[PDB]
TrEMBL record:
GO terms for biological process: bioluminescence; generation of precursor metabolites and energy. Belongs to the GFP family. The keyword Aminoacyl-tRNA synthetase does not apply. This is Fluorescent protein plum. (R)-malate binds at residue 7. It comes from Discosoma sp. LW-2004. Keywords: Chromophore, Luminescence, Photoprotein. InterPro entries: GFP, GFP-related, Green_fluorescent_prot. The keyword Metal-binding does not apply. It comes from the Eukaryota.
Length: 213
């Protein structure tokens, strides 16, 4: 059911520091090569009053290149699919938590996402929009408690020139008990490839590849 080319559709709804929004997206990629692009639009509550960059990693692990000998748990979860839940703790006390459902219908991946951001300082780089995308990330993947966990430190580049840091923990759970992998790493790079002024229209590109640790 996972072809060498696959599209996806995404609906995200959320709030950050009280500001409500919805985003719709359509994307496409090559799941066995670890590569994907997407076009996204803010459909309600745009222009966003905070950094797009805190949303970009919430907006697709079906598209991770896996060697032969690492069970690709997330592809094997389809057509039913998988749920994930995440928390990002940012250095200045900001917090993002995400709940997500992924499935496959009519030959395309369907993503349904709920995002809540809170406690970001008003004078911070997130509410002031002073960020400049993510550095490459390596996610520590390991089985625990019948689910696949991931942990990562992410570094958001700052326009003034430093970095702004977040510690991340996610639980990924297939809807049927398909084969969990052993411990490994997933190397990411995510790039914003286009945005309009106010970031109500945004394109992204991501590559991700798994490897033994
Ligand atoms: Cl169908």
């Amino acid at each position: 059911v996972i072809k060498e080319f696959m599209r996806f559709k995404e609906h995200m709804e959320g709030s950050v520091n009280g500001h409500e929004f919805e985003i719709e997206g359509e994307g496409e990629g090559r799941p066995y090569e670890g590569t994907q692009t997407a076009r996204l639009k803010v459909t309600k509550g745009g222009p966003l009053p905070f950094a797009w960059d805190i949303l970009s990693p919430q907006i697709s692990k079906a598209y991770v290149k896996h060697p032969a000998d690492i069970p690709d748990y997330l592809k094997l979860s389809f057509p039913e699919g998988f749920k994930w839940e995440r928390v990002m703790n940012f250095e200045d006390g900001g917090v993002v938590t995400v709940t997500q459902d992924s499935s496959l219908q009519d030959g395309e991946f369907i993503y349904k996402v709920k995002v809540r951001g809170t406690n970001f300082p008003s004078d911070g780089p997130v509410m002031q929009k002073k960020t400049m995308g993510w550095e490459a990330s390596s996610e520590r993947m390991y089985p625990e408690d019948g689910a696949l966990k991931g942990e990562m430190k992410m570094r958001l580049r700052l326009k003034d020139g430093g970095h702004y840091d977040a510690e991340v923990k996610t639980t990924y759970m297939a809807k049927k008990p398909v084969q969990l992998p052993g411990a490994y790493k997933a190397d990411y790079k995510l790039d914003i490839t286009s945005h309009n002024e106010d970031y109500t229209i945004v394109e992204q590109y991501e590559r991700c590849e798994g490897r033994h640790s």
